[PDB]
Structures are given as C-alpha cells and as structure tokens.
Design a binder for this molecule. Structure first.
Ligand SMILES: *Cc1cc2c(cc1C)nc1c(=O)[nH]c(=O)nc-1n2C[C@H](O)[C@H](O)[C@H](O)COP(=O)(O)OP(=O)(O)OC[C@H]1O[C@@H](n2cnc3c(N)ncnc32)[C@H](O)[C@@H]1O
Ligand SMILES: O=C(Nc1cnns1)Nc1ccccc1CCO
Length: 460
C-alpha cells in the first residue's frame, strides 16, 4: 500500500461504481489512491497473496460502456486522480522525442505538457482527450490519424506494468515483449500500466478542417479509401466520416490539413488540389480554420453543450465495430439502409471511416478483421433520460446489427468488446489468438484479479 490510501468515502465508491455507459453498477469495497507505481504493486501483490483473492481494477476516466473498470466487492485503483512529471527526451536512435507519462494521465494533460516543453505532441489521437493513457492503450486509441500513424498502441516505446502478481515490470518490443504486446490492446487483463513512453512529433500550429457531402456510398467510400492510401507525398492529416440523418441517405467526409508558420503559404493550394480529385456533391464543402489544440479538443466543446442540456449523464448503449472493406457496401445496405431504414433512429452520431491494418502491430492483443483495409463504424448512441424504452430500443438495434453481421458472414470485430460469454470471446479472438490470450493470463494474472469487469476470465 505504501504512500497510497484506501478510501471508503461514499462519493469515491459511487464514482467507482459507475461509468459513461450509465448502466453497469458493481460497487467495490474500497477505492485506492496511489502515490506511485509501488503503491499499485503493493495493493495488487496483497490481492494475489490473500487466501480468497479480491478483484482489483484500474479506473482511468470511467469512459467504459459496460462496467469494464468496475471491481465488485474489490478495490478500484483511481489512476487519473491528481497525485515530478518527466520532460520530453530526444533520442538519436529513435530519431525523435518521447515522453514518460503516468498510466492514469489524461491525453489532454499529456498534450498540454508536451506543447509547453518544446511544442511537441503525440502523433496518434482519440477524438476525445479526457481519456486515460492506460485506458486507451488497453484498447487501441483511434481517431482520423490512425490510417497513417496507426492507433495509439502503435505509438508507444515502453511501459511499466504492475502484473496480477503485484510485480513491477518494464517492457517494450525488446524487453519482456510478451507482456508489452499482451498489455497493448489487452483489456487490462495482464497488468496495470503505471508508465507509458509515448512517441512525439513537432505539433502543427493550425488546422484547416473540411467537411463535404455525398449521396453515393460507393463514391464516398472510394474517396475515403483513396485518401487513406496517400502519404507512403501530399495527403490529408486526418480522415473521418459519418452517416447523415436526412431529417436516400447522406454521408459526410471529414478531413483536415495541418500547418505551421512555414507551411501556411502552401495550405490553400494543397487543399484545393486534394479536393479537386474528390467526388463530393458540388457546393457542399464546409471549411473552418482553427488552432491545432482547438481542433483536438472539439469533442469536449460538444460535451459542455450536452451537459448544459442535461444530455451527457444518460445511458450510452454504444456499438463500435471494425468492418472489412470488402463487406462495407453490404454493411451500408444491410444496416444503414436496412436495420435503420435510412432514418436519427441511431440515437446519435454514426461515424464511419477506413484504416490500414499494416499500421497495427500484429503482435498486440488488439483484434481487427482479417483484411488490410477495414472500417470503424461507431454507433455513438445516447438513450433519452428517464425513458427505459429508449435504452431497450437502442440495445435491440445493436443486437440486430451483430445478428446481421454473423448471419451474412461479415467478419466484423467489436472494438471495446462487451461480449461476456466464453465461446463468444473465443469467436472474437479466433483459435490462435485465444490460446495466446489465455496463456498470457495464466502467466501474468493466474488468479484473474484484474479487470474482471471485462468478463473474460473467472475472477475471485
Ligand atoms: C466516453 C468516451 C469514450 C471514447 C471516446 C469519447 C467518449 C466521450 N472517443 C474515443 C475515440 O475517439 N477513440 C477511441 O479509441 N476510444 C474512444 N473512447 C473510448 C475509450 O477509449 C474507452 O472508453 C477506454 O476504455 C478509455 O477510457 P478510460 O481511460 O476512461 O478508461 P476506463 O474506462 O476507466 O477503463 C477501461 C479499461 O481499461 C482498464 N484500465 C484503466 N486504466 C488502466 C491502466 N492504467 N492500465 C491497465 N488497464 C487499465 C480498466 O480496468 C478497464 O478494463
Ligand atoms: O466517441 C467518439 N467520438 C465522438 C465524437 N462526438 N462525441 S463522441 N469516438 C469513438 C468512441 C468509441 C470508440 C471509437 C471512437 C472513435 C471514432 O472516431
């Protein structure tokens, strides 16, 4: 336990009993507030040595949908609560800068820290910055930059991990690689990340942010696929998209072009040349020019508007799927024009954009479809508050989408999976990856103390 403290404070318990999903409510016995990595090791070590064992889960910002950060009758480690920060460091071997961050650090605070110490910033993002480093690294961490730099799990040099035996282990591609690759995308199963060594680049100053409309899905996806194949060279720095509710279906392409004081003179010509090659509906180009930080933090501004309208602290029955590019047209037909019938019926934004599998290390625990180009399709649903029928309808719509994928053999894979059924986890991973996942579990968390809320292994 060391410098850290155990808390049975009512508000601490209440927060550790809830997440962004707003449904799962498993209460821990206590909330642990560590001062350092050693405190986390002491607590996990005490759980591993105890006769009965007890559940231990790290909580980042509690952005999980289905109780993944919850520890029923156990201890929730509040990693993100404020508790010495390492400055960025340049390596001539890596050919750039890295920075060591506490595992519970929010990406927003990492960004503010790196910009203030050399105008540096991480290369790979999430659309929302109030997420912990350990939380997104336990999943993948994706946004519109992932097609080029890969997800956040492809932009980490090293980790310190407290295993399910309470041992502090430093790992990287060349040091304890099984733990390193096991933890990256590992759903908190093999240890708690107390340190992550993040790749950095010189941050641009400004962003040209563009949106354009399409009515033809083949032309929309052909343009997204062409844009993500660039830069192997003139390209957009971010590529996303979303399905537009008409109240015939519309699609919106979202791209950006980053610039600084030096490149400001070529930005307008670069954007025009890239747009001139696209097939969006004429006269539907919407442009904004804004500082880099303001673009990165755009989702937080939307959050503030939702909180003011009492539309933030509502159930969020999200569904995030990775769909192979070869079946994206069938998905659009079956889901966007079928299950949804072209209708707001989704209960929130429906994001759609492709990524390149080659930017994803095949050794990590992350599960992607068995194809080079795949899409993220994100149903970012909000149920109406006080309306149980709203959550029932959206949960049923998620089940139909999964049933349509399984029924038509679309090799889709859930991102942030909420399976909680043995044969379904085995189907999610596939034979070879499941055997490796189970073997890593026997090695690093044999008692299944960690991240029991994921519902993969039988916990104490
Ligand atoms: C709420 C939300 C989530 C979100 C998003 C926008 C919002 C409003 N935008 C995302 C995006 O653009 N791209 C992306 O990849 N994910 C996005 N998300 C989802 C988000 O990544 C996940 O919710 C993720 O879980 C991170 O959120 P958070 O940091 O709050 O973590 P958590 O929910 O508490 O715990 C998640 C799991 O990881 C384990 N855990 C937590 N910290 C650690 C450490 N340090 N080491 C190891 N495991 C850890 C938890 O126990 C849990 O299983
Ligand atoms: O939640 C968002 N983006 C938001 C925009 N406005 N409110 S949320 N993304 C997300 C959420 C969960 C998983 C993956 C993703 C990445 C999609 O790029």
């Amino acid at each position: 336990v060391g410098g850290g403290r155990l808390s049975v404070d009512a508000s601490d318990i209440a927060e550790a009993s809830r997440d962004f999903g707003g449904v799962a409510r498993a209460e821990p016995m206590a909330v642990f507030h560590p001062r350092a990595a050693g405190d986390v090791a002491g607590l996990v070590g005490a759980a591993f040595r105890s006769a009965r064992g007890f559940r231990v889960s790290a909580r980042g910002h509690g952005h999980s949908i289905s109780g993944q950060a919850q520890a029923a009758g156990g201890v929730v480690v509040d990693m993100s609560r404020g508790r010495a920060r390492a400055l960025p460091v340049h390596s001539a071997a890596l050919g750039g800068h890295y920075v060591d961050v506490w595992g519970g650090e929010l990406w927003v605070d990492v960004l503010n820290w790196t910009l203030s110490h050399g105008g540096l910033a991480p290369r790979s993002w999430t659309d929302y910055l109030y997420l912990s480093v350990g939380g997104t690294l336990s999943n993948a961490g994706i946004s519109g930059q992932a097609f080029h730099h890969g997800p956040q799990i492809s932009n980490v040099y090293e980790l310190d991990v407290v295993t399910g035996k309470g041992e502090v282990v430093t790992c990287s591609e060349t040091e304890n690689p099984d733990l390193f690759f096991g933890v990256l995308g590992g759903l908190g199963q093999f240890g708690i990340i107390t340190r992550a060594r993040i790749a950095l680049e010189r941050a641009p100053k400004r962003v040209r942010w563009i949106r354009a409309l399409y009515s033809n899905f083949s032309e929309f996806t052909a343009d997204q696929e062409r844009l993500i194949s660039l830069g192997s060279g003139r390209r957009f720095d971010y590529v996303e998209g979303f399905v537009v509710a008409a109240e015939s279906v519309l699609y919106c392409l979202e791209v950006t072009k980053n610039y600084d004081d030096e490149t400001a003179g070529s930005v307008d010509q670069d954007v025009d040349t890239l747009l001139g090659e696209l097939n969006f509906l004429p006269g539907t180009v919407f442009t904004t020019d804004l500082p880099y930080v303001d673009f990165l933090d755009r989702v937080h501004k939307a959050e503030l508007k939702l909180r003011a309208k009492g539309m933030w602290e509502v159930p969020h029955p999200w569904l995030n799927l990775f769909v192979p590019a070869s079946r994206i047209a069938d998905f659009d037909r079956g889901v966007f024009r079928g299950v949804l019938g072209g209708r707001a019926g989704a209960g929130g934004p429906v994001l759609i954009y492709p990524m390149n599998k080659h930017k994803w290390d095949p050794r990590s625990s992350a599960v992607t479809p068995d194809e080079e180009v795949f899409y993220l399709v994100a149903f970012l649903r909000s149920a109406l508050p006080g309306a149980p029928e709203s959550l029932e309808a959206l949960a049923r719509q998620n089940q139909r989408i999964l049933d349509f994928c399984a029924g038509t053999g679309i090799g889709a894979k859930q991102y942030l999976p909420g399976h909680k059924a043995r044969h379904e986890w085995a189907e999610h991973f596939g034979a070879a990856r499941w055997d490796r996942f189970a073997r890593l579990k026997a090695e690093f968390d044999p008692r299944a103390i960690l991240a029991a809320g994921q519902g993969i292994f039988r916990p104490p």
